[PDB]
Design a protein around this ligand. Structure first.
Ligand SMILES: [Zn+2]
Ligand SMILES: [Zn+2]
Lengths: 164, 412, 76, 355
């Protein structure tokens, strides 16, 4: 089923989201992403690598971060996102614009420390919730800001009467 | 800030730019002609005043009378040039007024779009005028010209429609008429004379843009001079007009010279499709010269509109019920637009357009609760059918049900 | 006052609510008009999730707003 | 917008006043007129002098000098003015009309209409002209307007007598007489298939107008209501289809131009030929004509060959989607939107119909 993939990619394109295909494959590509305003991830700019399997509607897409982001449920050596909705609670109803605009900010605004993917991030989150913001700002600065995204990616006579 | 999602005024200006491109061409032609003739007349007056000054050298009575005669001639010439300038100014003002009226029209649109039930009606009226302009332009573009026995002025259905609808200044309707006249002369009358006159009038622009139209016209004339055997006239026309084209094209000239006594190289040369190929060349050159759009705008608008609202399910007592359905007023379902509807593609909908509170009946149809109740009340009041209290009736598949057998539905 | 809610699919729903109405009541109304149980149902206004305890008057409304309907998400 | 202001400010330079009455060439005309004036004056002076000659040497020298001094002034002033006209024209063109050539409308024209369907484009135009612009025609009495339409506009479509009668009765109503409209409404009331509430309201409006600044608004309301009621009663289109189609085409223009950019920027392929790729948003009075259902899982319209089916708890999905989720009616599954399991107890093909 390529119709669903094509429609989702077109829906992503027709908005302000910046989408770049790789070798025009139409099943794997990159999407630009901007941090949500309220959270400390406010000025950060990131790039996501997504890959859609051939059986896309009933198989979850593979999404990762090619930049560096600090988060308990997000890897540091890579950007392997891990949350249930994508992994085990995926219904053939969500879309790419939907998935980004709903559950990327959703995961950014609700970390879970029961079984995290980043151990040091979990330890920091459980200990202090005031210097975590300055850390995240810090790491964002060293790895992903606008500049980093730009770099890595006479006499006049008299008068005689006249005839009509 | 659009009312019903309509584009801004700048897009309207960009959308039909021929309306501003054609009057400018007429203005440029007027200015060029005036400049050339007035320079020539100035030179003539200069030589006149040199001769008169020479006449004044000899202080004699006879020479003085000759000088007075020369001054009289000068006055006559200046009166002539004054009349010419008056005519030119009279022609100038009308072409300026055309653009004035178009600008006022679009300014009225902008004023309407800068002020909602009361405002919507004004926009609808403005778009009615817009579609009238488009329809009139289409009708003027392609409709046979009917000659007038009185005043000998050409007229068409588009021209009379524009004159009667008070949209006179918004469409030129005369350069389009000239194009139609020349094109129909080429296609049907086979006259070929108006095209030659047009080429002669507009020879410099054709040479500057290096369009192969004068040579093609002369070649067609030469061929037409051999279908009926007039060998001396054919030879003299060849030597007078076809010769100066040796440098530009030589193989065609050699083939034309070979065509002097009447081999698949000749069916194309004597075929009738050459009349059209001269029409296509002339029309392309004319539209490039004036700026007229290569296609009829109304056709573009229809092509977009038909595919923009074509759905999948769009072609597949009793009288009132049949008229009660709301799917019998689709603008693209009508018997007039059916073949075009079949030709054009479908539409892309990303959301489901439906009604508010659906309920499903045992037969297998989903209706709207409030509308169904209102229909039942209307049927009961006018006595189209007798019903038990607390019952509903479905329009298609004539049947009656109770309110206890309707199941809620949740479209998504 | 009538307010609009936009769902994941895209469908927009208008509904009547009073400033004294609790968010549980809004969830019940959405349950009635959609059929999705209120427990797995969250609202989002100005990028902030809304809790059941607080009522509609706690968050300012201009009598014509655009809430967002959202499902449940959790990491692991 | 701003571009229209640019046109309006650059156009005013053609005239020489704020009232937009006098062009630039009038300077040429006045210069030539003045030139002729002093030519006439100097010739009459020559004659006064000749007749006297039958002191004067200088009197002749002034004439000789002036007669060549005026011609030079006329030449200088005239060439200057026509140059300034030409320079102004070229400046206006370059600075104003070169901002429009970026958009070529002809590039949008794909999926061209077949050449064999011009008999329908010329038939819808006739209907539109009959519906809207019939009052301006000098039709006069009936049975000659037929010849007028057939000879001038070439209109020979079926819905002609109804529109002619409609125009005649509307013109009569415009004079204040309400006998015709009342008789027609009373005649239409007899049948058992007419909208009685609308006819009753129209009769009440006619009664109020018959009893009677305020009249003009009532007259317009009664006229519009009669138009709507008659068009509904005679089974004809209140709004001509061509107008609605053109109004849709405008919006389609606005979105297409954008899609082609996203096409040049990122190269994408749309493999479904019969459906145009992008999406267009239409106003309220141009959408709800047919029931359109978009499947949540496949995001595709629902067709008679792909009927919609209702699950266990009354959600609606496609037919092939239900076949794929529950493979050929073998296993069960839950809704893609709520945790309620579904089996082959799913109801039959649900049919959406607009009431
Ligand atoms: Zn239809
Ligand atoms: Zn369900």
């Amino acid at each position: 089923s390529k119709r669903r993939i094509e429609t989702d990619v077109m829906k992503l394109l027709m908005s302000d989201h910046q989408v770049d295909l790789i070798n025009d494959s139409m099943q794997e590509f990159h999407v630009k992403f901007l941090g949500p305003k309220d959270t400390p991830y406010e000025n950060g700019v990131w790039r996501l690598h997504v890959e859609l399997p051939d059986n896309y509607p009933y198989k979850s897409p593979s999404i990762g971060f090619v930049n560096k982001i600090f988060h308990p449920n997000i890897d540091i050596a890579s950007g392997s996102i891990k949350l249930d909705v994508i992994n085990s609670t995926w219904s053939p109803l969500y879309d790419l614009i939907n998935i980004v605009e709903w559950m990327i900010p959703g995961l950014l605004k609700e970390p879970n420390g029961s079984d995290p993917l980043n151990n040091e991030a979990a330890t920091l989150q459980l200990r202090d919730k005031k210097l975590y913001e300055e850390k995240i700002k810090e790491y964002i600065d060293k790895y992903a800001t606008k500049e980093k995204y730009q770099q890595m990616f006479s006499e006049d006579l008299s008068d005689i009467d006249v005839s009509d | 800030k659009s009312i019903f999602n309509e584009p801004d005024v700048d897009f309207h200006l960009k959308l039909n730019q021929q309306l501003f491109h054609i009057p400018y061409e007429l203005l440029s032609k007027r200015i060029k002609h005036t400049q050339a003739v007035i320079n020539k007349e100035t030179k003539s007056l200069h030589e006149h005043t040199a001769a008169l000054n020479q006449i004044f050298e000899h202080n004699d009575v006879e020479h003085d009378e000759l000088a007075l005669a020369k001054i009289t001639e000068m006055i006559r010439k200046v009166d002539h040039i004054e009349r010419f300038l008056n005519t030119q100014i009279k022609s100038y003002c009308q072409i300026l007024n055309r653009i004035k009226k178009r600008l006022e029209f679009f300014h009225e649109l902008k004023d309407i779009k800068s002020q909602n039930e009361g405002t919507r009606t004004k926009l609808i009226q403005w778009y009615q005028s817009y579609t009238n302009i488009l329809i009139g332009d289409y009708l003027t573009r392609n409709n046979p010209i009917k000659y007038n026995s009185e005043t000998k002025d050409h007229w068409n259905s588009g021209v009379v429609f524009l004159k009667q609808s008070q949209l006179d200044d918004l469409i030129d309707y005369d350069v389009l008429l000239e194009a139609n006249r020349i094109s129909t002369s080429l296609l049907h009358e086979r006259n070929l004379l108006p095209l030659i006159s047009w080429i002669n009038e507009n020879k410099k622009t054709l040479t500057k843009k290096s369009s192969i139209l004068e040579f093609q016209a002369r070649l067609q004339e030469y061929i037409e001079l051999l279908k009926v055997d007039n060998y001396t006239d054919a030879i003299v026309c060849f030597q007078r007009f076809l010769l100066p084209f040796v440098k530009s094209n030589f193989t065609d000239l050699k083939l034309a010279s070979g065509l002097l006594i009447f081999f698949e190289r000749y069916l194309n040369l004597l075929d009738d499709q050459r009349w059209s190929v001269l029409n296509d060349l002339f029309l392309s050159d004319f539209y490039s010269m004036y700026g007229i759009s290569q296609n009829d705008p109304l056709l573009i608008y229809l092509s977009l509109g038909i595919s923009s609202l074509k759905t999948r399910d769009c072609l597949h007592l009793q009288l009132f019920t049949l008229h009660s359905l709301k799917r019998k007023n689709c603008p693209v379902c009508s018997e007039t637009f059916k073949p075009i509807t079949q030709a054009l593609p479908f539409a892309h909908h990303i959301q489901s357009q439906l009604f508010e509170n659906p309920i499903l009946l045992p037969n297998g149809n989903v209706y709207d609760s409030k509308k169904l109740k209102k229909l039942a009340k209307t049927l009961k009041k006018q006595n189209l059918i007798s019903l038990n209290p607390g019952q509903i009736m479905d329009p298609v598949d004539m049947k009656i049900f109770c309110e206890s057998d309707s199941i809620k539905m949740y479209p998504t | 006052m009538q307010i609009f809610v936009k769902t994941l699919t895209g469908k927009t729903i208008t509904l009547e609510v009073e400033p004294s109405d609790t968010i549980e009541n809004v969830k019940a109304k959405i349950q009635d008009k959609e059929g999705i149980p209120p427990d797995q149902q969250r609202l989002i206004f100005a990028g902030k999730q809304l809790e059941d305890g607080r009522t509609l008057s706690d968050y300012n409304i201009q009598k014509e707003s655009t809430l967002h309907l959202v499902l449940r998400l959790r990491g692991g | 917008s701003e571009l229209l202001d640019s046109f309006e400010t650059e156009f005013a330079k053609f005239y020489t006043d704020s009232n937009l009455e006098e062009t630039n060439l009038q300077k040429c005309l006045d210069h030539t007129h003045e030139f002729k004036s002093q030519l006439k004056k100097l010739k009459a002076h020559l004659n006064k002098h000749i007749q006297e000659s039958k002191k004067f040497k200088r009197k002749r020298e002034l004439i000789i000098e002036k007669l060549s001094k005026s011609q030079r002034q006329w030449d200088h002033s005239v060439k200057k003015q026509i140059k300034y006209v030409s320079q102004q024209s070229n400046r206006f063109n370059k600075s104003t009309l070169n901002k429009l050539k970026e958009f070529d409308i002809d590039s949008v024209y794909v999926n061209k209409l077949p050449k064999e369907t011009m008999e329908n484009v010329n038939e819808a135009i006739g209907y539109h002209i009959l519906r809207y612009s019939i009052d301006n025609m000098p039709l006069g009495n009936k049975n000659e307007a037929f010849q007028y339409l057939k000879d001038v506009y070439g209109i020979t479509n079926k819905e002609s007598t109804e529109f002619i009668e409609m125009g005649q009765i509307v013109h009569d109503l415009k004079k204040g007489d309400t006998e015709s409209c009342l008789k027609w409404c009373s005649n239409e009331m007899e049948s058992l298939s007419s909208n009685h509430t609308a006819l009753s309201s129209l009769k009440f409006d006619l009664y109020t107008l018959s009893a009677m600044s305020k009249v003009n608004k009532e007259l317009k309301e009664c006229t519009s209501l009669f138009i709507k009621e008659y068009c509904a009663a005679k089974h004809i289109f209140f709004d001509s289809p061509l107008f609605l189609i053109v109004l849709s085409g405008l919006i389609s223009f606005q979105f297409f131009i954008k899609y082609k950019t996203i096409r040049e920027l990122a190269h994408v392929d749309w493999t479904t030929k019969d459906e145009l790729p992008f999406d267009v948003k239409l106003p309220d009075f141009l959408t709800h004509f047919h029931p359109i259902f978009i499947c949540p899982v496949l995001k595709e319209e629902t067709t008679t060959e792909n009927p919609p089916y209702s699950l266990a708890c009354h959600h609606i999905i496609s037919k092939k989607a239900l076949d794929r989720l529950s493979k050929n009616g073998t296993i069960t599954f839950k809704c893609p939107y709520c945790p309620v399991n579904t089996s082959m107890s799913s109801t039959k093909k649900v049919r959406f119909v607009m009431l």
